């Protein structure tokens, strides 16, 4: 959970352009499906409009 390899940048023609970028550390962050589903659950209610009889 510490390795950060080099990622290739592809040109608009689908070929590697020769440039490389070290993998950002965020892509090694803990993957928590329970947290994501909790946040997605509660944030998705914030764009609701009220209804009432």
């Amino acid at each position: 959970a510490c390795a950060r390899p080099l990622i290739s940048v592809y040109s608009e023609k689908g070929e590697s352009s020769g440039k490389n970028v070290t993998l950002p550390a965020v892509f090694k962050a803990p993957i928590r499906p329970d947290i994501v589903n909790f946040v997605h659950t509660n944030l998705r209610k914030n764009n609701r409009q009220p209804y009432a009889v």
Binding site: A1, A25, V26, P30
Partner: protein
Amino acid sequence: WRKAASLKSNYNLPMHKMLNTDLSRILKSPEIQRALRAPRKKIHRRVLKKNPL
């Protein structure tokens, strides 16, 4: 992990609760394998009781 966020006033990546998730590798390592008792993989099914008399 080493450098805090620069564009967020005060933030850093969430820490890992488990650094190595390769459970198969962890269990097959000599360190753990040396501490194990021998497995008991023999099934002792029910014996039918026959009357000795």
